[PDB]
Ligand binder design. Structure first.
Ligand code: BCL
Ligand code: BCL
Ligand SMILES: CC[C@H]1c2cc3[nH]c4c(c3C)C(=O)[C@H](C(=O)OC)c4c3nc(cc4[nH]c(cc(n2)[C@@H]1C)c(C(C)=O)c4C)[C@@H](C)[C@@H]3CCC(=O)OC/C=C(\C)CCC[C@H](C)CCC[C@H](C)CCCC(C)C
Ligand SMILES: COC1=C(OC)C(=O)C(C/C=C(\C)CC/C=C(\C)CC/C=C(\C)CC/C=C(\C)CC/C=C(\C)CC/C=C(\C)CC/C=C(\C)CC/C=C(\C)CC/C=C(\C)CCC=C(C)C)=C(C)C1=O
Ligand SMILES: COC1=C(OC)C(=O)C(C/C=C(\C)CC/C=C(\C)CC/C=C(\C)CC/C=C(\C)CC/C=C(\C)CC/C=C(\C)CC/C=C(\C)CC/C=C(\C)CC/C=C(\C)CCC=C(C)C)=C(C)C1=O
Ligand SMILES: CCCCCCCCCCCCCCCCCC(=O)OC[C@H](COP(=O)(O)OCCN)OC(=O)CCCCCCCCCCCCCCCCC
Ligand SMILES: CCCCCCCCCCCCCCCCCC(=O)OC[C@H](COP(=O)(O)OCCN)OC(=O)CCCCCCCCCCCCCCCCC
Ligand SMILES: COC(C)(C)C/C=C/C(C)=C/C=C/C(C)=C/C=C/C(C)=C/C=C/C=C(C)/C=C/C=C(/C)CC/C=C(/C)CCC=C(C)C
Ligand SMILES: COC(C)(C)C/C=C/C(C)=C/C=C/C(C)=C/C=C/C(C)=C/C=C/C=C(C)/C=C/C=C(\C)CC/C=C(/C)CCC=C(C)C
Ligand SMILES: COC(C)(C)C/C=C/C(C)=C/C=C/C(C)=C/C=C/C(C)=C/C=C/C=C(C)/C=C\C=C(\C)CC/C=C(\C)CCC=C(C)C
Ligand SMILES: COC(C)(C)C/C=C/C(C)=C/C=C/C(C)=C/C=C/C(C)=C/C=C/C=C(C)\C=C/C=C(/C)CC/C=C(/C)CCC=C(C)C
Ligand SMILES: COC(C)(C)C/C=C/C(C)=C/C=C/C(C)=C\C=C\C(C)=C\C=C\C=C(C)\C=C\C=C(\C)CC/C=C(/C)CCC=C(C)C
Ligand SMILES: [Fe+3]
Lengths: 305, 275, 250, 81, 53, 44, 53, 44, 44, 44, 43, 52, 43
């Protein structure tokens, strides 16, 4: 039986340039390419993109942050292109040391460049957030994507903005290296007792696992009912066919309750969004409220002794 | 109590083992042959968990833990209070998980639809079986399985992680984390896009699937498409499961030092070895 | 706020976690009730209202506006299914299968069940018919993979029922959705691409017998297809996966 | 014959049918069970050929003295260590 | 009184199943609570009383 | 004479009477068991 | 009494399936509980009784 | 005449009679087993 | 006595297959319960 | 009559007698096995 | 008269024949190798 | 009459999969023997002929 | 001749012939190589 995992025969007509629903067309590029290796899995069209004020500004600020991280790597390699490549994952642009507190007076190669890059990184993610909002607004769509992105941004900002301010030191923000930010994560768990005994870290993991499991379930369900017009999820929300019914009856017979075509996406939205929302809460409480989650768990009756 | 469209789908057929012997529903739940076996396995495992809890000193459901046998029993069957209850529950868990998948197969056969759901759940089952069977068999002791408890199995995760230094430096672990993070991001974006199209700005007609192609093409330049997003989410989650299982399988069987030292192949490449 | 606790060991952390549990119970209530907009109220096995309806009450009515002058849709609708189902219960109790009273595939029951959708074509964002034969699209062309047109089509018993003569594509999402089969029976037939495997020598359909191909639900027109016709065709093949499985080899 | 037996033979056809069916059920169960046991035994055998440091990992579970059901209150699997 | 009119409200099948499940779980929990307490664990008490039964 | 379950008033009465006999038998067995347990190992 | 009217309420096929499941599960549980107690584990009791059986 | 299962009153009576014979046989065997076990190793 | 009437409710073919499955599973429970006890394992 | 399986009364009696023959054969072989094990390694 | 795999009936027969020959030779040579590695360094 | 299976299953996929499986099985058995310092034909040669 | 490989029976014999020539040539070179290695450093 055909498993709808890969397309068998690809087809292509005139390239699709998008819906016009209040988008400024002069900010939308005009060139599309049609790349058939992608058409085995999904769409083949590498479509146009929209480039307006917010996107341009976000790209400029983010690219400058990226550039500044790179330049710091070059300088700490003592200019060597060999060390630069050998340490592309092991090097990091680190925040100022604890003695500088939250002041903006730390040497340029000991946190100052970290501060400047961090400022421009902050600017670009917020501008990208505004972009996600405004692209929905220009098409007349709801704002669910921007809200979901706000949750992930909330974890990001508690990581490097909110919590270091509440702790009184930039030195607790995460550095900009591939391996050093993993080292940062490990150190963070090690200094706050053990982050497994942080209930919001537990809840964040539950929502991460659940969102992975949920989208295994949902992708498998839609693929299983693809024989019927299944993946046309919109228009099954407003005109229920057998794909939606059989999808509902599978899960009802299996676990005793089911979702609807529209409502499974609310479950997934909330499970995905709750992972960084709950995670940010648990990091924010670490150090500020609880210093040692292990003894806190012992006091609150979920760690023995 | 049937859904208002359910009746026309409640027909005989689709079973694998026992014909019409178990081909009936109990409330919402289809039973079938593997519903009988999954109920029995689940009940016996739960009930042995409760019995093992009774032999301890706490009834707190966050402190109850059933522990695997000590290493000195190797791969033998342990005395029932010295790890044997763990083995009974583990065998019951495998029985129930496998029965659950086979029951899912029968439901798919009755509602003639693809078998993707039991396949994906089998990937989850494989991760579990790697954790409690495959890895401890290669290491030669059931006691390398993880203790059963809401917060004590996290002690297992901690101890095994810190056996190999910082477990972050495990390339398969890195790959698995990226797949978990990415599938969560993809679920967020897919749910958001569907909800945005179905729930427009106030007073506007419902959006089309063209509008959502247009939304991602405007935002990132690419749209995978309606069929593509489900294929993508399915394979992302399945790969996360599989590469996590490979991550843990490699640790203690073929790799034994701190995982950080694995990257010494790159850091000790002879041209920049000494720099 | 370290070590400073409300209530004698109740913290800002304790407060946060209890607050989350309260919010999450409310969100579960909201999510469950949102997911009850189809299929309720629960019925009994004779088409009448069920005695039990569950702990969750139904949500308030919500309306969808449909583009291209296709009215409004309010859910939950409280309406019962708008088709008759030729089944008959096999037991006086509940929880047992209902048996087909005639041909399950022709009647449209079980895995061959179709839902009564509107007898109009699904539309793309510009108001045109979404799924059409390539003779109509006329700017579509095969881009990769092997073209099935002209190949013989082989049923789930190894007998050839005809040849692929046309593809029906989705003009919005650039995809082939149906294969039009010219039958040696004497007529034509649409086969869902999700139910066909294209190979070098033939397209093989392992869900439908050769005798079943003589009675595939027809379309009114050969330039467009309604959602009702789509449901009937796809349901016919998916039901064949049960009601034709004995015709397979061995 | 709209019954899997009609004439039945009442003692021999029925007996052969029942022996065939019960033997089929038992035989498939035996095949599955021995395949699983063989897979586990093969994994243990293979693990015997892994490097010796595959047998150095310490016991990865924490015994909390409130879950210790061995018989003595010590926080460990007694009679071993 | 006239509590029989509960059967005008609830279906007997659902109530009997629910009652059976409830009673089974309650009886199991009470016995387990007794057995976990070494003042009402009858197996060990009999071991003590009869000098290892 | 309407009801949620569709049972008539008479049907509910006989149903309830049989159910009450069953409940009373269960309760009387439980009572005898509790007297035995209390004589053996009093908990109050 | 006239408890036979349970069969006007509960169908015998499902009742017999559920009854078999429950009864076998209860028997297995009780035997397992007895095996875990070192006063009612008959294998070890016989081991002691005969000097290693 | 209340009947959910579809039986008549007579078929229910016959079914219950056979069921009770089965139950009594099972319980008799269990009683014998418990008496033997109590003699072998008493638990009250 | 009248226990033969069980075959009026449960089809004997399916019961035979299911009973084969059940009997083998019961056997494996008992054998490896025995293997769990040191004094009754026969491998060594 | 009460026939879920479609058998007649007479077919059920004959199949029950065959089933009983098979079950007593199985039990007798099991008894021989238990006597052998008990002689070898008695558990009571 | 076309198959699922595209093989005719005749191609299937000769293919199965050579498949059985290949398996027979593989097993026979494996037996010979085990005999040789048993006469050399007995285990 | 078993050859009819090749009208159902594609012989190409089956043959490749069986070949890969047999090859890996042989490879890992050889790795066992070479890991085992009792059969280990190379090293033992360096003792039979005294470094050969 | 729309075969699965697009070949013909006559092309099949010649292609198989060149295949067997190459295969036997490779195997003969391999056997003489193993003979030389065994003489030089027997295993
Ligand atoms: C020794 C290591 C510690 C540990 C320490 C930490 C710490 C420290 C943290 C976590 C956090 C998380 N941990 Mg951990 N954790 C451990 C063990 C585990 C285990 C396990 C099996 O053992 C698991 C499954 C997890 C799981 C998780 C996640 C649930 C959670 C992050 C959620 C999230 O949304 O992330 C992914 C999302 C983000 C990282 C958000 C930011 C991403 C932003 C939005 C990106 C924007 C764009 C970007 C700027 C630019 C580039 C784009 C251009 C295109 C190039 N932890 C142990 C105990 N864990 C976090 C948390 O929430 O804790 C409560 C956290 O901070
Ligand atoms: C000190 C701790 C170490 C560490 C040590 C380990 C170890 C050790 C392991 C992992 C594993 C994983 N870690 Mg790590 N990990 C750390 C930090 C992290 C961080 C982080 C941000 O710091 C993250 C995101 C992760 C992420 C991950 C995942 C890639 C993976 C867990 C998923 C998995 O296995 O699913 C697999 C899913 C399952 C096993 C679920 C199976 C479910 C079954 C089939 C069904 C059960 C049903 C249930 C009984 C039913 C109840 C009934 C009710 C009705 C519902 N780790 C640190 C550095 N990590 C694990 C892994 O890869 O496992 C394979 C693992 O073993
Ligand atoms: C619900 C929570 C999950 C989530 C949600 C989420 N993320 C989102 C969204 C949502 C709903 C978006 O709408 C938004 C988006 O647009 O996605 C497509 C986004 C997105 N989440 C992203 C990443 C991301 N999300 C993550 C996590 C998650 N996001 C959560 C699991 C992670 C993790 C796990 O760490 C990452 C890394 C992005 C793909 C995107 C946000 C886009 C963005 O932030 O843009 C800001 C831009 C920059 C920093 C510019 C970088 C520029 C390049 C470096 C230029 C290169 C130039 C050249 C190579 C040279 C350069 C150097 C010099 C010479 C210039
Ligand atoms: C488009 O499609 C989609 C839907 O549908 C339209 C959906 O519904 C869903 C399904 C997903 C949801 C409804 C969202 C919520 C789901 C989750 C968050 C997943 C987590 C769910 C749980 C917490 C699992 C709990 C449910 C279980 C395991 C049921 C437990 C039941 C038993 C153990 C016993 C079962 C009873 C039996 C077998 C009776 C046997 C009888 C005898 C007598 C024997 C998906 C994925 C979907 O994509
Ligand atoms: C510490 O040592 C030990 C171990 O560890 C080394 C062990 O693992 C174990 C053994 C392990 C377990 C107990 C768990 C794993 C068990 C299995 C692998 C076997 C699985 C058993 C089943 C799935 C059987 C379940 C059977 C049921 C539910 C009964 C079915 C009854 C019905 C359906 C109703 C009646 C039937 C009908 C409808 C027809 C009527 C019948 C006629 C004959 C007529 C033990 C005991 C042990 O102690
Ligand atoms: C021995 C102990 C047993 C329990 C301990 C196990 C741990 C439990 C923790 C998770 C809870 C899982 C239990 C799920 C119950 C499954 C049974 C079920 O849900 O079906 C019953 C009910 C009836 O369905 P229906 O009639 O259709 O409802 C609508 C009609 N009014 O259907 C419904 O109720 C519909 C409502 C759906 C319920 C939503 C499920 C929420 C799951 C989200 C959890 C994710 C976060 C978990 C955090 C974990 C932290 C450790
Ligand atoms: C256990 C002892 C009781 C079972 C013995 C008898 C079972 C007979 C088979 C059976 O279950 O019947 C199906 C039952 C009744 O449904 P029938 O579908 O009524 O017709 C509907 C008419 N309105 O179908 C049902 O409706 C079953 C559900 C009835 C209501 C159950 C209420 C909740 C169940 C317990 C709460 C959940 C806890 C489950 C276990 C938790 C373990 C931690
Ligand atoms: C805690 O762990 C342990 C497991 C320690 C303790 C567990 C104890 C428990 C719960 C044990 C459970 C035991 C049970 C429920 C056993 C049930 C056994 C049964 C019902 C056995 C029935 C066997 C029936 C058979 C084999 C029927 C065969 C019928 C046939 C027709 C076979 C056909 C062949 C022949 C020769 C028929 C004869 C015909 C002629 C004409 C002679
Ligand atoms: C680490 O592993 C250790 C070392 C433990 C021990 C090793 C154990 C091993 C190696 C086990 C595996 C043994 C194997 C795989 C044996 C199988 C050998 C095979 C598949 C032999 C088949 C050979 C085919 C040959 C040699 C044909 C060769 C040459 C040609 C056809 C001519 C040139 C090549 C091509 C492709 C062009 C085609 C030619 C023409 C004329 C068109
Ligand atoms: C100290 O720890 C504490 C924490 C233990 C834990 C819990 C303490 C608590 C809260 C305990 C609360 C316990 C409760 C609520 C107990 C209530 C128990 C009940 C309601 C028991 C009722 C049993 C009823 C029975 C057995 C009824 C009927 C049985 C029959 C055989 C009747 C048959 C019915 C028939 C035949 C109807 C057919 C009639 C017709 C006309 C067809
Ligand atoms: C050839 O040219 C170049 C030089 C391209 C070679 C380039 C090499 C490059 C670009 C190397 C870059 C490497 C890496 C490793 C980039 C990624 C680093 C990582 C792991 C970043 C993860 C960061 C996580 C967080 C939470 C970051 C930021 C969070 C914020 C809330 C930002 C805002 C924080 C502050 C303190 C804003 C400061 C504001 C003021 C007013 C001081
Ligand atoms: C530590 O203590 C723990 C924690 C154990 C907790 C205690 C838990 C307990 C013990 C809970 C409760 C157990 C309970 C409440 C009840 C058990 C009831 C039993 C043993 C019922 C057994 C019935 C056996 C029967 C009915 C055998 C039947 C055999 C037959 C051949 C009957 C044939 C029947 C019919 C109807 C033939 C068909 C006839 C026609 C006319 C179709
Ligand atoms: Fe979806």
């Amino acid at each position: 039986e055909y498993q709808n995992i890969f397309t068998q025969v690809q087809v292509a007509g005139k390239p699709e340039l998008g819906m016009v629903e209040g988008v400024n067309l002069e900010n939308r590029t005009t060139g599309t390419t049609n790349w058939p290796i992608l058409g085995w899995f999904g769409n083949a069209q590498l479509g146009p993109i929209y480039l307006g004020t917010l996107g341009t500004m976000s790209l400029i600020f983010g690219a400058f942050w990226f550039f500044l991280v790179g330049v710091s790597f070059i300088i700490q390699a003592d200019y060597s292109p060999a060390l630069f490549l050998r340490e592309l994952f092991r090097a990091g642009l680190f925040p100022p040391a604890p003695e500088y507190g939250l002041s903006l007076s730390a040497p340029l190669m000991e946190g100052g460049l970290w501060l400047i890059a961090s400022f421009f990184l902050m600017l670009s993610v917020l501008l990208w957030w505004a972009r996600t909002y405004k692209r929905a607004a220009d098409l007349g769509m709801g704002k669910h994507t921007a809200w979901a992105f706000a949750g992930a941004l909330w974890l990001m900002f508690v990581l490097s903005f909110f919590r270091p301010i509440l702790m009184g030191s930039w030195s607790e923000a995460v550095p900009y290296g591939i391996f050093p930010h993993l080292d940062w994560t490990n150190n963070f768990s090690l200094t706050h007792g053990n982050l497994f005994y942080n209930p919001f870290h537990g809840l964040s993991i539950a929502f991460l696992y659940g969102s992975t499991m949920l989208f295994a379930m949902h992708g498998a369900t839609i693929l299983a009912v693809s024989r019927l017009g299944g993946e046309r999820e919109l228009e099954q929300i407003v005109d229920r066919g057998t794909a939606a019914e059989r999808a509902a009856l599978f899960w009802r017979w299996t676990m005793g309750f089911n979702a609807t075509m529209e409502g499974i996406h609310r479950w997934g939205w909330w499970f995905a969004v709750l992972t960084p929302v709950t995670g940010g809460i648990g990091i924010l409480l670490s150090g500020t409220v609880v210093e040692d989650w292990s003894v806190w768990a012992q006091v609150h009756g979920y760690k023995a002794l | 109590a049937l859904l208002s469209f359910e009746r026309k789908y409640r027909v005989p057929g689709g079973t694998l083992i026992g014909g019409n012997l178990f081909d009936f529903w109990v409330g919402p739940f289809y039973v079938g042959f593997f519903g009988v076996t999954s109920v029995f396995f689940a009940a016996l495992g739960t009930l042995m968990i409760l019995w093992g809890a009774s032999l301890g000193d706490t009834w707190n459901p966050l402190l109850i833990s059933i522990n695997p046998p000590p290493l000195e029993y190797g791969l033998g069957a342990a005395p029932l209070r010295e790890g044997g209850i763990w083995q009974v529950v583990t065998l019951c868990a495998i029985g129930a998980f496998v029965s659950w998948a086979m029951r899912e197969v029968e439901i798919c056969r009755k509602l003639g639809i693809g078998l993707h759901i039991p396949f994906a759940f089998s990937f989850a089952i494989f991760a579990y079986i790697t954790l409690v069977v495959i890895r401890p068999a290669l290491m030669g002791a059931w006691g390398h399985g993880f203790q059963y408890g809401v917060f004590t199995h996290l002690e297992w995760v901690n101890n095994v992680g810190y056996q190999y230094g910082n477990f972050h430096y495990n390339p398969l672990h890195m790959l698995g984390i990226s797949l978990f993070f990415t599938t969560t991001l993809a679920l967020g974006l897919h749910g958001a896009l569907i909800l945005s199209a179905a729930n427009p700005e106030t007073g506007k007609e419902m959006r089309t699937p063209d509008h959502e192609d247009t939304f991602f093409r405007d935002l990132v330049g690419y749209s995978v498409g309606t069929l593509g997003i489900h294929r993508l989410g399915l394979l992302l989650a399945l790969n996360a499961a599989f590469w996590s299982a490979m991550c843990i399988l490699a640790s203690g069987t073929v790799w034994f030092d701190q995982w950080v030292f694995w990257w010494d192949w790159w850091y000790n490449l002879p041209f920049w070895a000494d720099l | 706020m370290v070590g400073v606790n409300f209530f004698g060991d109740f913290d800002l952390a304790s407060l946060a976690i209890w607050s989350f549990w309260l919010f999450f119970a409310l969100l579960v209530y909201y999510l469950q009730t949102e997911n009850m907009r189809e299929g309720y109220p629960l019925e009994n096995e004779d088409g009448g209202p069920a005695v039990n309806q569950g702990p969750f009450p139904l949500p308030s009515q919500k309306t969808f506006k449909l583009p291209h002058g296709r009215g409004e849709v309010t859910v939950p609708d409280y309406k019962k299914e708008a088709r008759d189902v030729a089944l008959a219960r096999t037991a006086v109790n509940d929880g047992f299968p209902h048996a087909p009273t005639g041909n399950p595939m022709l009647d449209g029951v079980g895995p061959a069940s179709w839902a009564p959708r509107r007898d109009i074509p699904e539309l793309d964002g510009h108001g045109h018919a979404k799924v059409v034969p390539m003779s109509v699209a006329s700017a579509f062309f095969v881009s990769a993979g092997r073209d099935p047109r002209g190949l013989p089509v082989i049923a789930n018993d190894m007998k050839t029922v005809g040849t692929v003569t046309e593809m029906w594509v989705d003009v919005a999402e650039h995809m082939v959705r149906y294969l039009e089969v010219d039958l040696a029976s004497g007529g034509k037939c649409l086969v869902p691409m999700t139910m066909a495997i294209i190979k070098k020598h033939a397209v093989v359909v392992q869900s439908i017998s050769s005798a079943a191909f003589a009675s595939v639900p027809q379309t009114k027109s050969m330039t467009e297809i309604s959602m009702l016709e789509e449901e009937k065709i796809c349901a016919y093949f998916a039901g064949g996966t049960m009601y034709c499985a004995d015709a397979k080899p061995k | 014959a709209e019954k899997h037996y009609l004439d039945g033979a009442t003692k021999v056809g029925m007996a052969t049918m029942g022996a065939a069916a019960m033997g089929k059920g038992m035989g498939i169960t035996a095949v599955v069970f021995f395949g699983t046991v063989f897979f586990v035994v093969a994994l243990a055998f293979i693990g015997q050929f892994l490097p010796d440091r595959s047998r150095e990992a310490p016991y990865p579970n924490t015994i909390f003295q409130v879950n210790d059901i061995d018989g003595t209150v010590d926080g460990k699997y007694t009679r071993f260590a | 009184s006239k509590f029989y009119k509960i059967w005008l409200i609830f279906d007997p099948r659902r109530v009997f199943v629910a009652q059976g499940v409830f009673l089974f779980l309650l009886a199991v929990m009470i016995h387990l609570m007794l057995l976990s307490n070494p003042g009402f664990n009858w197996l060990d008490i009999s071991g003590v009383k009869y000098e290892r039964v | 004479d309407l009801s949620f379950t569709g049972l008539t008033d008479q049907q509910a009465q006989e149903l309830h009477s049989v159910y009450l006999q069953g409940m009373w038998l269960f309760i009387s067995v439980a009572i005898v068991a509790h007297l035995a347990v209390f004589i053996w190992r009093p908990w109050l």
